[PDB]
């Protein structure tokens, strides 16, 4: 029966706090306008999830912990509930994977509806995969029962649902990450090279004598315009000027091109530095993810490998109390938003104060 559990008080904060933050998120991206791009789409998708978990799945969670772990409801919906709990896991699992993936892509070939075809695919695959859950558990209580207690209890659910639904999109998540943290540092890389042969070829073009030079200059000038369309027809008019031997004329024309080169140059520059700043927090998204479920994840795949070696009792406390970090992740998101971006933070702040007018 109730058993006067202490456990509540700390499982109902982390339930308001993962229902308050997570529609902050959603009036966020709603609402906000500099906040409706595909990342940000996909952060609403993954904030409905974790709405979701705090609502249906977390106070049930803090239900059994008020009965001992005896399951209180009706037996049917033990089923449902564990459904339930591992689809708003996996389909928070495949988000992140999707972002990353989308992110890395996005960079290589340079639409709303795009991002809603993806997360309405991510949320089918997360449905179909964890649909032997009710399909099998319904109709044999043993699979979802051990003792009187609701929890996954076929140990080849919990292997293969595992590594299926949890390492798979882990493991291209973090290659993903990876190869667009590489890669951005690649964009900026070439982009201070393309800017030194600009520099360079410009005070040619200033100290030049003859034709011979600035038309040298001005040609490399508009190879390594060819790398970052205004500024290539603007290079080839004083190219033409050069190759009827105005030489002073194509002079002027150059620093005629210095303003376009600062402004072109300083805007892709600042478009790199956004995206990095945004892979950071992303990572930031996804390391809590994986660290907050780690102890849970692990031990409930250390339970499969010594079985009746250790101490199952003491496995089973384990994961009732490690069930809770990784419920708490759905409570930090929001926060990270706030730490971490003005648009969100500002958002958050007026939401608060109850005015909704962008
Ligand atoms: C990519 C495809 C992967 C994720 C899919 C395609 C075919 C799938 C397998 C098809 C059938 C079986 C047999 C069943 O008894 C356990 C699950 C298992 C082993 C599936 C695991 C996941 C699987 C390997
Ligand atoms: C990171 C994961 C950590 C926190 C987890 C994953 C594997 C876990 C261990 C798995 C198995 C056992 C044996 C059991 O008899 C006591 C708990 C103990 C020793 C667990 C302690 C916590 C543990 C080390
Ligand atoms: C309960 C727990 C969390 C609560 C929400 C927390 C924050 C907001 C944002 C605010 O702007 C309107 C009320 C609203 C939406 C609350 C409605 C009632 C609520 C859902
Ligand atoms: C990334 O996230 C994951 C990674 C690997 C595995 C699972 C997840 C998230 C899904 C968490 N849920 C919590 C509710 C159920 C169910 C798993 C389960 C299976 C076996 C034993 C369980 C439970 N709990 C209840 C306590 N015990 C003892
Ligand atoms: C943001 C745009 C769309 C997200 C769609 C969100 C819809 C997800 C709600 C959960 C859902 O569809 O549940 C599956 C169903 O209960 C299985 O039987
Ligand atoms: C961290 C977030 C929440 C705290 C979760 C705390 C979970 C505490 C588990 C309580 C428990 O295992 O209680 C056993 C019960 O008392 C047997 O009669
Ligand atoms: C997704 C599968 C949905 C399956 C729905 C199962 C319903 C279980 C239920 O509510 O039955 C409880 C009890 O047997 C009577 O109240
Ligand atoms: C998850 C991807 C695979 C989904 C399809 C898996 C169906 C097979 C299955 O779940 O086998 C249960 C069987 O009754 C033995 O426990
Ligand atoms: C025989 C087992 C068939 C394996 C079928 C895999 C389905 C299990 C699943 O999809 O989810 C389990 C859950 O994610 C784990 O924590
Ligand atoms: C990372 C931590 C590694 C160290 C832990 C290794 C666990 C097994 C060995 C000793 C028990 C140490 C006490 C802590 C775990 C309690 C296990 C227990 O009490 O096991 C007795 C039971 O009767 C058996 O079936
Ligand atoms: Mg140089």
Redesign the pocket.
């Known amino acids: 029966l109730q058993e006067k559990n202490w456990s509540a008080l700390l499982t109902a904060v982390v339930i308001i706090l993962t229902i308050a933050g997570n529609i902050l998120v959603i009036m966020a991206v709603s609402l906000e306008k500099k906040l409706q791009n595909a990342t940000n789409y996909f952060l609403m998708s993954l904030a409905i999830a974790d709405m979701l978990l705090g609502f249906l799945?977390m106070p049930v969670?803090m239900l059994t912990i008020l009965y001992g772990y005896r399951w209180p409801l009706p037996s049917k919906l033990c089923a449902v509930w564990?459904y339930l709990?591992?689809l708003f896991?996996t389909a928070?699992?495949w988000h992140l994977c999707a972002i990353s993936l989308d992110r890395y892509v996005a960079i290589q070939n340079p639409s709303r509806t795009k991002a809603f075809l993806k997360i309405i695919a991510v949320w089918t695959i997360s449905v179909g995969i964890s649909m032997p859950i009710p399909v099998f558990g319904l109709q044999d209580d043993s699979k979802v029962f051990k003792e009187g207690?609701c929890?996954?209890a076929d140990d080849n659910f919990?292997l293969i649902?595992?590594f299926v639904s949890?390492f798979i999109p882990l493991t291209i998540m973090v290659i993903t990450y990876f190869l667009t943290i590489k890669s951005l540092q690649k964009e900026a890389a070439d982009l201070e090279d393309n800017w030194e042969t600009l520099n360079d070829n410009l005070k040619v073009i200033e100290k030049a004598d003859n034709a011979a030079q600035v038309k040298d200059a001005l040609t490399k000038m508009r190879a390594a315009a060819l790398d970052a369309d205004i500024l290539v027809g603007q290079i080839d008019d004083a190219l033409k000027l050069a190759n009827e031997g105005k030489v002073k004329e194509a002079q002027a024309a150059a620093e005629q091109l210095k303003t376009t080169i600062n402004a072109y140059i300083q805007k892709y520059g600042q478009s790199i530095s956004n995206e990095q700043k945004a892979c950071k927090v992303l990572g930031i998204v996804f390391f809590l993810?994986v660290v907050m479920?780690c102890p849970?994840?692990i031990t409930?795949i250390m339970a499969v490998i010594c079985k009746e070696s250790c101490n199952e009792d003491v496995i089973?406390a384990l994961?009732?109390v490690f069930?809770w970090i990784?419920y708490l992740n759905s409570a930090v998101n929001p926060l990270v938003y706030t730490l971490f971006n003005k648009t969100y933070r500002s958002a958050f702040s007026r939401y608060i104060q109850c005015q909704y007018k962008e």
């Open positions: 799945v969670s564990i709990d591992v896991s928070k699992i207690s929890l996954l919990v649902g595992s949890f993810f479920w849970f994840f409930n089973g994961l009732n069930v990784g």
